[PDB]
Structures are given as structure tokens and as C-alpha cells.
Design a protein around this ligand. Sequence first.
Ligand SMILES: [Fe+3]
Ligand SMILES: [Fe+3]
Length: 305
Amino acid sequence: DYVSIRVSTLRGDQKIDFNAYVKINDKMILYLRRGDSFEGERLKRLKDKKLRKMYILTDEENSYRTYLQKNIETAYDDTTGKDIQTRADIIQGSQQNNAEEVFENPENVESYNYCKDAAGKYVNFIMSNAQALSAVMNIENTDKTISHHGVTVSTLSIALAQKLGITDPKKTQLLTLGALLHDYGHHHSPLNLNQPLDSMSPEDLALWKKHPIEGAQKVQDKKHFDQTVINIIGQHEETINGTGPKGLREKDMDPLAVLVSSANAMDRLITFEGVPKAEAAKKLMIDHVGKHPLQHIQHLNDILK
Ligand SMILES: [Fe+3]
Ligand SMILES: [Fe+3]
């Protein structure tokens, strides 16, 4: 009777041609009403509620799904000169959505290639628009979800990739996709990420240390998965002085996973540890001395401001 949708797919200024319900005590409350839109402070109010899921009437699906396609279509369109926060709203939420599919459907070959394909679209979107990054960085991770945090890391990762003069589209594409999915090993996990790793109980820290090794075990076996991606998923907590979980050093890694390992260190601070954007790079230079290419750290410092 009802079909669930992910909230990150409701973005931008197009008025909806369907109603959307949230579930309370097994009943479906009508929350979002026909003609509603989500541009501006609307998206914040919408995210202040920890709604991961909403629902639509099985006979309003086409309406919704048509809405979603037109949404992403026109958002990638570089021509329409539509507001950049607006386009960024739509695409960030869409990248976030694609990563959730793969996370819940990692064996689904077709989901993967959609995400991978979208990854490419995102790169071309980030490079080809000056505003993009600062606009995508406006959308907070209020929920603190690994899917949104993975969109954030991929974003830092692209900008970083550009500073380092990494240009191969197959590579920025594969880099982004693997940053997006980078935390799949946290998926369905008891661990509360919203704390600092120093303030972690040994029961948490040891549960945290397992996540790259486990996350990678769960996908190295699926032929449709690129190896760069498996590597990124498996290696992104590794640090150049080998203090990360597997204890790898720069020689042992995917170069692209070093680059992701740095872009992740930044957002764990900003998002999971409440360090203000401006001081994250500094925190790392001092309290995380040795763990990351200082050049990476420097560039990310620039990117932020
Ligand atoms: Fe991680
Ligand atoms: Fe992470």
C-alpha cells in the first residue's frame, strides 16, 4: 500500500506532485503535502528531524520517481544557470541516496553501476562549477550519517585530487565512488561515531578498528566492484606513519586511498568531533602529526577557506 523513499531525494525548488508520509506507531501521518518544495531554509528544517525514511502511496510512485529524475537531470545541466545552492542541494542528496542503495544492496550489480556512473557526473559537476564545493559544503550532516559523510569526503577528495593535479577521469571517477562508499563497514553498526576516537571506550575503539577490514571483506568477493574501490574501503583509515588499523604505510596503499584517508581525517573532525572547519587542518598538523601527507593537509586547509 505504501512505498518507502529516502529523504535525501527530496531537494531543490520543484514543487512535489505527491504526498509523503512519516510512520508513527505503525500509522502513516501525512507530513509532506502536494505543492511543497525544499529550497533554502526548508532543507534545514527538513533535516533537523531525524527522518531517514518517508513513504508514498504505491499509486503516487511514478509521480515521485518522475520528480526525482527531472530533479537530478536539470541539476546536472550546466546551462540552466539555476541557483548553485539549489543544484547542489539536489545532487548532494542524490549522491547520498546512491550510496545508500549500494549499502543496502551491495550485490545488486545495477545499483553499483548507477552510483559509479553518478560519481563521474559529480566530478564533472564539482570541477566545472566554482560555487559547487562551497555550496555542497553548506549542507550540514545534521543526521551524522555515513552516507552523507561519504558524500562530504568524496567532495574534499575531488578538490584535493585537483590540487594534486590528478586528472585521469577513470581515476577521479573511481576515487569519488570509493570515497562515497568509503564507510560501508560502519553500515548497520552499534557504534556511535559522533564521538572522538580518543574519548572512546576500548569496546568502541576495537569495534571501530574492525570497520575497514570488515567493510572490505564484505565486497572484495563481488565481481562488479572495482579494485580501487575495494582498496579505498579497506585502506582509508591507514596513516602514512602506519598508525591506522591495518598498520599500512604509504608504500602499501592505493595512492588514491592515501588521498581519501586525508579527506576523511578532516571530516571526522568537523562532523563527528565538532571541530570548526577553520581549525581542523591545524588540529591535524599538531595532534595528528605524522599521519597524513602534510601536502594533503595543506591543500585541504586551502580548500576550506
Ligand atoms: Fe572510516
Ligand atoms: Fe569516515
